[PDB]
Amino acid sequence: KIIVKHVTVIGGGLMGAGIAQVAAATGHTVVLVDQTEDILAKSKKGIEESLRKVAKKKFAENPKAGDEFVEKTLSTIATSTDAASVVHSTDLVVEAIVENLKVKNELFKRLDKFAAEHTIFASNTSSLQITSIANATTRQDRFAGLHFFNPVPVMKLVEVIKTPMTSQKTFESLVDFSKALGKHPVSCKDTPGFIVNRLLVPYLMEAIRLYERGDASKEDIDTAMKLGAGYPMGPFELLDYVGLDTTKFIVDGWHEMDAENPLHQPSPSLNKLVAENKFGKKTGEGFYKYK
Amino acid sequence: KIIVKHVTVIGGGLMGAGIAQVAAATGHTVVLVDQTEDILAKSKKGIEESLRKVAKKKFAENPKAGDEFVEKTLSTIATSTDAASVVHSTDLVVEAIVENLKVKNELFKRLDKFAAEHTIFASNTSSLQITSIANATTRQDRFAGLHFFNPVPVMKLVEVIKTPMTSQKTFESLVDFSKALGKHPVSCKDTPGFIVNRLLVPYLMEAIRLYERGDASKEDIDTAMKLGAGYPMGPFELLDYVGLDTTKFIVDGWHEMDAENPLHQPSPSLNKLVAENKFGKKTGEGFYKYK
Ligand SMILES: CC(=O)CC(=O)SCCNC(=O)CCNC(=O)[C@H](O)C(C)(C)COP(=O)(O)OP(=O)(O)OC[C@H]1O[C@@H](n2cnc3c(N)ncnc32)[C@H](O)[C@@H]1OP(=O)(O)O
Ligand SMILES: CC(=O)CC(=O)SCCNC(=O)CCNC(=O)[C@H](O)C(C)(C)COP(=O)(O)OP(=O)(O)OC[C@H]1O[C@@H](n2cnc3c(N)ncnc32)[C@H](O)[C@@H]1OP(=O)(O)O
Ligand SMILES: NC(=O)c1ccc[n+]([C@@H]2O[C@H](COP(=O)([O-])OP(=O)(O)OC[C@H]3O[C@@H](n4cnc5c(N)ncnc54)[C@H](O)[C@@H]3O)[C@@H](O)[C@H]2O)c1
Ligand SMILES: NC(=O)c1ccc[n+]([C@@H]2O[C@H](COP(=O)([O-])OP(=O)(O)OC[C@H]3O[C@@H](n4cnc5c(N)ncnc54)[C@H](O)[C@@H]3O)[C@@H](O)[C@H]2O)c1
Neighbours of B177 (CB within 10 A): 27
Interface contact B188-A262, CB threshold 8 A: no
Chain B: residue whose CA lies nearest to A220: B186
Long-range contact set of residues B254-261: C-beta below 8 Å, sequence gap at least 24: B254/B127, B254/B192, B254/B193, B257/B192, B261/A262
CA distance B113 to B134: 14
Nearest listed ligand to the Cα of residue B111: 4
Q: What is the 3-state secondary structure (H, E, C) of chain B?
A: CCCCCEEEEECCCHHHHHHHHHHHHCCCEEEEECCCHHHHHHHHHHHHHHHHHHHHCCCCCCHHHHHHHHHHHHHCEEEECCHHHHCCCCCEEEECCCCCHHHHHHHHHHHCCCCCCCCEEEECCCCCCHHHHHCCCCCHHHEEEEEECCCCCCCCEEEEECCCCCCHHHHHHHHHHHHHCCCEEEEECCCCCCCHHHHHHHHHHHHHHHHHCCCCCHHHHHHHHHHHHCCCCCHHHHHHHHCHHHHHHHHHHHHHCCCCCHHHCCCHHHHHHHHCCCCECCCCECCCECC
Whether residue A11 is annotated as binding a ligand: the answer is yes
CA distance A18 to A147: 12
Type of residue numbered B94: V
* Nearest Cα to Cα of residue A160 among A179, A147, A150: A147
Peptide bond preceding A151 in cis form (omega within 30 of 0): yes
Q: Mapping DSSP to helix (H, G, I), strand (E, B) and coil, where does residue A31 land? A: strand
Distance from CA of B217 to the nearest CA of A (A): 10
- Asked how this structure was determined, the answer is X-ray
CB B21 within 8 A of CB B50: yes
- Whole-number Å distance, alpha carbon A154 to ligand 1 midpoint, is 6
Q: Which of A186, A191, A232 sits opposite B224 (nearest CB)?
A: A186
Triad B207, A267, B257: Cα angle to 5°? 55
Looking at the DSSP bridge assignments, the partners of residue A95 are: A10, A123
CA distance B222 to B213: 16
Pick the CATH number of A1-196 from 1.10.10.10, 3.40.710.10, 3.40.50.720, 3.40.50.2300: 3.40.50.720
Nearest listed ligand to the Cα of residue A106: 3
- Whole-number Å distance, alpha carbon A219 to ligand 3 midpoint, is 28
CB A81 within 8 A of CB A35: yes
CB B87 within 8 A of CB B46: no
The answer, for A74 touching chain B at a CB cutoff of 8 Å, is no
The answer, for A196 touching chain B at a CB cutoff of 8 Å, is yes
Peptide bond preceding A164 in cis form (omega within 30 of 0): no
Span B200-286: which CATH code? Answer: 1.10.1040.10
| DSSP letter (8 states) at residue A140 | G
Looking at the DSSP bridge assignments, the partners of residue A157 are: A184
CB A159 within 8 A of CB A145: yes
Triad A61, A67, A70: Cα angle to 5°? 115
CB A121 within 8 A of CB A146: no
Type of residue numbered A192: P
**Bridge-based pairing state of the strands B120-123 and B143-148:** parallel
Phi, psi of A33 (to 5 degrees): -120, 140
User: In the annotation, is B118 catalytic?
Assistant: no
* Nearest Cα to Cα of residue A147 among A91, A111, A189, A109: A189
Interface contact A155-B228, CB threshold 8 A: yes
CA distance B179 to B184: 6
CA distance B244 to B248: 6
Looking at the DSSP bridge assignments, the partners of residue B157 are: B184
Say which residues have a Cβ less than 8 Å from residue A99's Cβ, sequence separation at least 6.
A125, A126, A127, A128, A246, A249, A250, A253
* Nearest Cα to Cα of residue B99 among B206, B233, B201, B245: B245
Which residues in chain A have their CB less than 8 angstroms from residue B199's CB? 203, 206-207, 210, 221, 225, 235
Integer-rounded Cα Rg, in Å, for chain B is 19
The B120-123 sheet, strands edge to edge: B77-80, B29-33, B6-10, B92-95, B120-123, B143-148, B157-161, B184-188
CATH 1.10.1040.10 segments of chain A: 200-286
Resolution value in angstroms:
1.8
CATH 3.40.50.720 segments of chain B: 1-196
| DSSP letter (8 states) at residue A100 | -
Interface contact A198-B206, CB threshold 8 A: yes
Triad B254, B220, A207: Cα angle to 5°? 40
CA distance A206 to A265: 10
Q: Which of B195, B206, B233 sits opposite A224 (nearest CB)?
A: B195
